Symmetry: D2
């Protein structure tokens, strides 16, 4: 391995060109983003054989300073004329390889820094000025671009995602029928309040569709979130494994331009404390000990 | 000082009695809570002269185990027949002093663990089953109760609050006219994107009104949140100090049953990177260095 | 309430005057501080009735920008000629009130950012490095100071407190917790031998605030020495509870430092849950508990 | 991809077999581990094509509950008779594949939960305590292991890696960063003497996986010794960049441990910003930077 770069490059842009005309799906009201505020956290990694002596000899002649890479990203957010993080990553990548001929490979991660609307008043409406910083789920994007021997540039990998989704379904979930042996102490549960954390990532058949230039073909993280919550509600779940497969199948049915969906899920279900409350369908639970189950699974189109 | 207790007592209750009929205000749509899911993080502290020898002699005869205090709280969440955190704290407090005659003083903090609705589908609606765990703002409550010499119990202190509100207003804020001397390097800014964190706490004229038994008199954290966002939108702010005073005045005008409102605010405004973008009203900003300004201020009715 | 200020004012100073001339105790080899690297995180709060209209009218005329308070702290760390965080806070507070006549009260907190020595081979042998330090995320010293301006424009310290924060200690045996109340709320078993794991925050107040500054260092009480008393007493004691332990720690502190007026403890119980009791042919296995934690708050006075 | 498992499996063991018989190096006094207290955080991932219908059909017949995997790990820490995290992972992996025939692949990560010695006065003198330990939030050792079941039901290790995580080192002088590209994106000044602050994660692979287990301890490479090489080289070197430094650290590691095949570095730059350059009558003042951090990823091979 030989690469270097800059992490935690925060950049907030006001009044990015709005994303509009995204084809809708029945699980989600999403049709676009107003982009009054567009926040992103970028990580940039660059590589190339000509970087060797920066390591082996302490020669900085071909070192773009990581601080300069931060300036590059922030200046390019000011000049970007597109409408998505995926497209912003492409713009940065192409511009960086064009600028620095000694770099053979660039890898970028962009994480949305999400904001929510707030109420302002003779009637409450969404404010165009005041927004709430959200620490809940957020969109992500990843891009790798290389310079070939014939000096053409090529995207070698692209992936979009949704991170930090935390969903609890109070009833309508079972976990029964698993292996019972000398190591098993978990009771079977025919009705648990399954609490899952979800990170969902998708890849497109055609990299162009990720940029949003033709919004009809763009798959928004907001729509993925809404599919996940709908499928979870609809399904008598039999395990997290069962749930995530069904979510993936629905995503790929709604978005035929997608090639695959990948899931990283964790189980954070609470421990039950009070099983029966007189005169109520209610129950009391509490936080479990730290160990958490997880699942990782790809569904392909 | 001499007290002991239990912290991080998480307790999640399904199907608490709904809070309904809260008198509305124009800044907020809030009228109640369905309480399908009711999550709280409780801290309990107890004191009394009879605890001395548990410290000075290692005598545990009058030590209620902190683990038992956790069981007490979780069992009482199962039996609570009310509709608010404030009322739950009163129920726990009265029950604990009634149970343990050697305790002279109990202090409780309750923090909401908030959950948000999600979409499920032939039309999207809010799910009654699937909820999103939120890491954004949340309601709080605090209660202190004592046993008097004539053996009556009395609430000595009650306070409600909203914590973790993070609001950014992209324009319509200035900070000018402050002291310029040998220590001043901050440029005056006639139009900054003020980003404030807010913790807001209120006290009632009549402790009864905090419980929610008469919802007409209950002041919900959701309504406080919506007043804050409305006032921030409405105001050409001149500093955080100026903004929080105005928020407090509005709160006390809307809620005459309140005696005071207290604010703890922090300044997290971003540093500007790009001041002018051709053909746009947009700008680019980034995260500042760690130091943060803060303000603390009480407004009284 | 009405005040404002700046938090997370980090400041790192190289080559502060070393702390030496301290008075030793049996429980600690502490003999001073080299101060090649001195880091502090400062919070500053200021008040005064003349600040009212900055809130009620948006009048910034008497507002010292919080950014300027950060500059003030950082510049004064460069000029500070003393040897302790406590003395640094006094230097900042006195200087700030002298600069800003409309401020009536200042409150300061300083938290040490601790570094540990590393070793290097050079010129034939391994020795402590004067250049390379390891940042520590473990325990650290703290200080608190409040100062006021009186009607006659004199300045008085109104409260001072020192402390040690973030000490996490586990004793594998020699602790019991038995004899507590057993009623309809009790499910905790009696335990004659548990691996008690405590978090300790310990704070002390001096009889004479001058002794906190270090200008006569024999009278200073170092957080390092308090740390070492805590670990020694925990080892020495067949503990009957955390309450029992912290009282005995406090007694030892006050016996070793007669110039202290009191010591205050905030302790938390983070003891692990037992998984395996018997291992064939003296060990056991434990794991992390559920989140709820017991805590204790207790003062011992001289 | 298809796998599942359990994360944050904390396990604390008392009185593990001590590690001794290690081979020393000039840069480190490390001589073994007492193992009075041995803590580990384990993540376990398992796969196999027979798990498909647990996802596609909700059939739990071949699902080992993740809770049971936690039980498995905790119970095997009680029975483990070796002396290293690397050996513990092998013991767990081999045992798990032997128990569960439908599992084709297991991946394990173990992270040391480190504790430091404390001292106590007893029977007339201050000495290291055998009972009281301080939990550390600083650097810690790591291990990684992947094992597979072949068609003939033999088991093979397919990847092994050891490491040191969380090392944070600041060198106050004797570092430069000059000569980098100066163009329309450059605003960083050249600096002939900066207080370089690096975070280091260092990972190593052995030529022969057996040497990682500790059963012949003279061939084991301890994270403590790697830590001490890193601090020594940082002191010894007039650094020209972090890239320069980590290459030299890697060279020294590979020279001192010829049984290693390679060493991999993930470094981050957290150097403070300068506030005061000149202090009257050699110190300076620095403060925390904005969040963006440079990083480097680099392998040195034998
Ligand atoms: O959904 C689940 N999948 C699992 O693999 C599992 N293991 N324990 N609980 C579980 N729940
Ligand atoms: O609103 C503000 N109040 C302040 O006191 C301040 N100080 N710096 N910036 C500031 N902004
Ligand atoms: O030392 C202890 N003190 C307590 O009060 C307590 N309660 N549960 N366990 C405990 N341990
Ligand atoms: O050591 C460094 N390497 C780098 O690549 C770099 N970029 N900015 N500062 C730096 N320091
Ligand atoms: Na739709
Ligand atoms: Na209303
Ligand atoms: Na000395
Ligand atoms: Na030895």
């Amino acid at each position: 391995v030989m690469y270097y770069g800059k992490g935690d490059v925060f950049a907030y842009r006001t009044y990015l060109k709005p994303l509009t005309g995204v084809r809708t799906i029945p699980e989600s009201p999403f049709s676009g983003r107003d982009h009054i505020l567009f926040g992103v956290n970028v990580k940039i990694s660059v590589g190339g054989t000509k970087l060797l002596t920066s390591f082996t000899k302490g020669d900085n002649s071909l070192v773009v300073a990581t601080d300069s890479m931060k300036n590059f990203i922030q200046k390019h957010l000011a000049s970007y004329t597109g409408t998505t993080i995926e497209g912003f990553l492409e713009y940065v990548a192409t511009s960086f390889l064009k600028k620095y001929s000694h770099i053979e490979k660039i890898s970028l991660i962009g994480e949305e820094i999400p904001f929510e609307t707030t109420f302002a008043v003779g009637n409450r409406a969404a404010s165009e000025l005041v927004f709430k910083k959200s620490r809940n789920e957020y969109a992500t994007a990843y891009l790798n671009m290389v310079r070939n021997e014939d000096n053409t540039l090529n995207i070698t990998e692209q992936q979009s995602g949704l991170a930090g989704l935390q969903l609890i379904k109070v009833s309508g979930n079972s976990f029964v029928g698993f292996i019972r042996d000398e190591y098993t102490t978990l009771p079977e549960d025919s009705n648990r309040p399954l609490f899952v954390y979800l990170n969902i990532k998708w890849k497109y058949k055609n990299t162009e569709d990720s940029f949003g230039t033709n919004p009809e073909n763009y798959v928004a993280a907001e729509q993925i979130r809404d599919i996940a919550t709908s499928v979870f509600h609809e399904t008598e779940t039999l395990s997290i494994q069962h749930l995530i497969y069904l979510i993936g199948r629905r995503i790929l049915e709604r978005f035929p331009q997608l090639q695959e969906v990948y899931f990283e899920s964790q189980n954070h279900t609470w421990d039950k404390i009070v099983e029966e409350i007189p005169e109520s369908e209610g129950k009391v639970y509490t936080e479990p000990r730290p160990p958490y189950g997880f699942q990782c699974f790809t569904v392909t189109q």
